[model samples]
Target: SPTLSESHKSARNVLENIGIKIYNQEIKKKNPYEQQLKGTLDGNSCNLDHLFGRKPCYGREQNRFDENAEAYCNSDKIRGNENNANGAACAPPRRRHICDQNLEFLDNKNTNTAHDLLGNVLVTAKYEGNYIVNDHPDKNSNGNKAGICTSLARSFADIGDIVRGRDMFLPNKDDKVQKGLQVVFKKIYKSLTPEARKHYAHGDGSGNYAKLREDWWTINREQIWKALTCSAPYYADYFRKGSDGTLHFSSHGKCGHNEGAPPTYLDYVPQFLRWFEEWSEEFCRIKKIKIDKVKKECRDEQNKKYCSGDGHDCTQTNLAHNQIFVDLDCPRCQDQCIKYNEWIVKKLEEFYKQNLKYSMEIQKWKKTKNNYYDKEFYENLDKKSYSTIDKFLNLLNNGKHCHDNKDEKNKIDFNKPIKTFSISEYCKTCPLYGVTCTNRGICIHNS
Candidate 1:
């Protein structure tokens, strides 16, 4: 029989071999791409040429001023502050707005590109700023009447100012046009279609404003209306009556516009009237009430708070009460609102699902083609391999060996009378004698 030390050494070697195989197989299975790439490498250098082209690993090495460079290197081509050279010190970054680029491009611009560019810029500006000459007219009166490109530029600039929040409607600023524009923008923004709302209600990192998009505009509209409803007791001091006697306004900026620039008092009343009419019509239909009756009831509610029924209208009530008024809560309106909201949501979901489904399909196809072994297959294989090892070890431990017997004369003679021996002596002699017995007591001390 082998010594315990030898057996242990052999078992350890076997285990090390098994472990090496397992590790090699696992690495191969996990990172086949890396293995392929590694095979193509020359010791330390990889074949990244195909992957990243001829560019340096760190991107382009243009002679641009590193911000910390001298002023001479940053100077513009025309001796202006704008940076224009490959290694220039003062060149400005390229204007994203094509209109703001060199006038030469504008002079030579194609009709189609100009049209598309103007549309995009105007749309961006209306929500965001604009580029203009040093002495351009403020309102673009001549351009507006002529239907020329000038009005487009001015409008874009105006919209851009609003979008960038550089010039929000401030009542104290005493700019009637700005206040009017704010009122219009806020109303239109609130009344945006579901699709439009999705486009505009972007979050600025914090998830606080993210989920709020779902009900933001709806809530805004409700608040505007509620302020028009019954005058809440808390905001009573901020309430004021307009010269019209039939209109009420707020002295505070609680409506989110600038103080004194209450949205209800803006000149865009015609536009708001149209919007409110449409909203009221739909709202009445949802509640199964007549539009006129809804307005009368809302006015009555407004009058009870302020004790003046003259200017007790939805718009007035909203400004006075400083709350949002809706025929029903959003949760109740959800069923009616869902149809429109879901349409947009469905489009978004479909976009995600298509990409996800395509990815899953490709993965499934790859797995089938490669005949990948899943978890259960390897687990079963491990169990079988371990059982085989145990069986082999057990056999080696229990099997008899004749080599252990040293003296041939000591071997029992079959013809002589068998000597009685203990179990220990029987074990040592039995192997050399090639005797097989059943009971623990020796068979008449068989030789």
Candidate 2:
């Protein structure tokens, strides 16, 4: 019995660990910048302070002067002193017609390395100040052009930005952009067809191939559309309260793009662009090539039976190898991401089926023959359904954490008829009033 207890303990610990990993993966997949990152972006002090923190500019701080006092943040400027710091110091005029790194990205300081212009069209105009000392970008040009001074030209951040973008879109400029999407994009970018990547342009005089600067969603409407519809990934709380009611922090979301975020919220730009996802979907459909040397992603090198030199290939892997063969990324063998995603979809559907089952039963129980049950039959129906809900919460965590799962057979028969129980006698005698003590499977009812 003691030895069995040890086995159970190990299983318990492993299941808990699995939950953490699943939470991490799901959150990373859906919103990496939110949970995986350490700082913030998008804009001046949580202006949405009164609007429930979902503003395009959350956690923004003093942007009152990039050396341009009285000069301030513009158009949508929030309440504060001209020099109060919580507002844009000098309202940089809007150049909405075309992309201008500094003006539109709120990058008056020449710091935004991977600005929007990198992979988009930019219109140049002159500003009032010098590069950094008294720097001010041209704001008033939407259709027509300008220059009471030197036009910044179709502005670009040079090659350094490209390298950093390749190096995981790490922090720069407003000291943001890459966020949690860095590693993810690298893999996703490699998955794109070069044609798709080069679709967007940043007239940087860029011969820059390792082409990290492009607007991925300019074409191919259908294939990319369905592909981008993946389920939003999971998120788990990374912080909690101690006995003192003060937050004792851990890696709250196991992911992030925390403090010091920007005003424009460039970090959240992908939701508006689908190029990467589009390319990955199309790239997966392309065919593989025959090569004497098995390229890294050509097959499962570990499994001789999977992709033997004698000549066998996973069709999807072979076709998807153009990106891999170019010496870019073989983060994993070809199509593994695709297949993994398929399995997850199946699991998601199964969860949905269970969700529907629970709701329908609950509704029926609420009005069972218009609430005339002699008491036994009435409560019985709901208990049976609620019991299933309990079963689902367990499987939800258990399945979510069950990463690397290859099949769906680990759980025992879920199709069996449900059986529910009620300890009414104990409920009436409960000592602690309304304890609601859900400490374990044990439930305490307060009388």
Candidate 3:
């Protein structure tokens, strides 16, 4: 700016008393998820891909057990008779190679030109080029996949059905658009005039006289842009901006979900639970609490006392120790596990409620077509709601220390219906496993 600079007091006083603005020394940070990950987690960067009882499995017996059981349950959920090996179901996010829109909801208030709608697609292979595509071996003509871009000289596009004689948005290399644009020339060709010896379009052919057909485009832009809008859902134009001012082509696609994958809840919720569990553990470890030890000792003592008589033979007299986990929180401490579970369950409930409502809103908006034609579409929307809540409850149950032990103590009677235990029997497994002769299973006290 040509404007004068200011001091700290000047900056503070301007905002405090009157008009104020200052040049910030900081530059904005880039998005953390801007570049997506490549390849499967098979090299096992994180423990997410490590299977139960496998070589190089998780080191902790219980955490290993928890993940193993989760993997099994998710597999069972993803596949009925289907096998987990076939990523025909429930492939983890790492393998999906998804391109996030981050702003799929953006609309015309900002869509000044077609480029405003352009989004980035993240690549998942080992390849590089400036404004290029198919540079990867697998996607070249010799490869199974293909797409890349840089210095396109035009909208180097191929992500649409053949229409208007070619892909819609790219600069047309064909002459017929020029021919069709002749209608506008008729409307205002006379607006242009002979300057010296040449007619207005004297050199229109052979790519000479660039502006000879310019008036036609201004008047016919509506018809031209209409062709571009329809292709927006299929291809997302994006890039990799090297700090060197170079732009490389990346990946594409938005406005759609994955296929042959687990229902999205299964895909998303496990990591949600996993990350929160890390924080919960940190809170416990800080208090010098032997959490798993306390759980093992308390569970063994309670199970031996109540593991007889058809699984529900307890009275109010012995109900104090009959829950899945005893109060894992430290009362002398601040918000710990009890608060953790309560907060998580409540928040997870709101999570599903919000999503179910969102999916329902999409259902409402998608009703422009004959609604009757999409009975199955509406039904699928309904299915997403049930599964989303089911994931919330299932994650709450799957959490070993569900933070709510104190809050829920004695609230559930053994002889009654409990929403926590009201889920499918398969979901009632222990935090650490499906094998339930355990002193530490969800089924130990209330199954």
Candidate 4:
């Protein structure tokens, strides 16, 4: 009997250890409230001084910048005297439209690496007040020209500006054309199909602005529409978060640039764009060599699929990988994430089933003891700690900590029907029937 008691104590210790492992390994690490500060691409700043902390920028998720807003930040002019060590000393001009991407924090001294909400990094050069800057001064040029200074041009200009480490699109006296979109337009213009090219001019001069319109049928939206409609390989990325950390999609539905995809959100631009061209070149060559390898291994190795129950399935992991594979942008990768979540559901179900078995065994033990011992003795013996066991069972069976959002489908009643056992036989077979409780409440069998 003493050996049996010792064995039960050892088993209890083992079960409690597993409980700690499940809580530490599974539950605590997936807390959803974690956040990191990131700047918006259109150049806005949070209020640096507040009672509690910095406030989120006004119009944080929205794409269009209202220059009149309190959080609005721009670097349009460099001032020599207003240099403050605490905040920006000068505003660089919007001429090259590089400042449009939020170079406002670029002091004459320190070069800053700016990160948009989607985790893309754009490094800006230190400004020493030597660059020419201003908005387009050409009034005779039609703003409505098909490929004029639209947001797409503005986007390419902003990306180019930071990539080249200066505002490269500044107005020049010897410049034959506006450098913003025209340079990018030249490349895209060549990629257009012959039929589409016929509708727009291919002249290597400034007057041929007929192809850069924001219209659904024109250069920008037309290719995007084809991509969205599955006729092209281009994919626009959209990801935003709400107060409760809900992910919202579709920048096309809400942003200022309806044609803007990569420019709209910098979610996976550096990784995504590089993958786009290489995806075709490499995936094609491998397929030609081995169709089996194409079927098995031709997918993007850089962004491997996130399957369910990989033990690291949480909202944060999901959203982060959601960005990576969102650039992978394949339908199969989307399914892989969805499947990742479903695995947790199945795991919780398995735990629930195990809990039901323990519940039945505990109930039977209580019933058998009622017949074998007096009510007083049964009560004293039953006071042994079932708390550790119950806590462990509840954590696994509850399924609340398994996902970001509460799911109604996972809700389960912990009570399970106990299998019927003969109480008389259980009482007869009781190992501790002749046991007696001492003054200290320890149980001992008669010698």
**Ranked candidates (lDDT, high to low):** 4, 1, 2, 3
Compared with the true structure, all predictions reach lDDT values of 0.25, 0.24, 0.24, 0.26
> For candidate 4, what is the TM-score?
0.17
- Where does candidate 4 have its weakest 10-residue lDDT segment? 125-134
Angstrom error of the Cα, residue 301, model 3: value is 2.5
Candidate 1 stretches with Cα past 4 Å from truth are: 1-159, 162-164, 168-172, 202-447
Tens digits of lDDT, candidate 3, 344-393: 35333433433343344344545655532224333443444322434323
Residue-level lDDT tens digits of model 1 in 343-422: 32432332233223323333343355454222322333245432343332322222112112245533321112122011
Per-residue lDDT tens digits of candidate 2, residues 1-447?
111112111212222233233223323533222211111120012121221101112232323222211211222332221232221212121111112233223223332322222221111111111121122222332321111011121111111222134221211244233332243334444444455334322366323323232222111111111111111011211222222334322221211112111101111111101111111111111111111112333333243212212122221123223311122233332333333334334333333333443444444556666632122332432343323554433322222122212345322222321211111111111122322323243333334
How well does candidate 3 match the true structure, expressed as C-alpha RMSD?
25.0
Better of 1 and 4 by lDDT: 4
Candidate 1 structure lDDT: 0.25
Model 2 ranges off by over 4 Å: 1-332, 370-391, 395-447
| lDDT (10s digit) by residue, model 4, range 1-447 | 111112122222223223233223323443221111112331111111220011112112331222211111112232211223222221112222232222322222222212221111122111110011011121133222111111232233333323323322322343322332334334444544554445444455332333222111111222222122221111322222332334434433212223433222221122111111122122222222332222232132233322221222111133322421122323333343344334324323433433443444345556764442123222322354543345433322322111111345323223321211111111121122232344553434323
Off by over 4 Å in 4: 1-12, 15-330, 370-383, 387-389, 392-447
Give candidate 3 regions above 4 Å deviation.
1-337, 355-359, 362-367, 370-418, 421-447
Question: RMSD, each candidate, Å?
Answer: 42.0, 30.0, 25.0, 31.4
Rank candidates by TM-score, best first: 3, 2, 4, 1
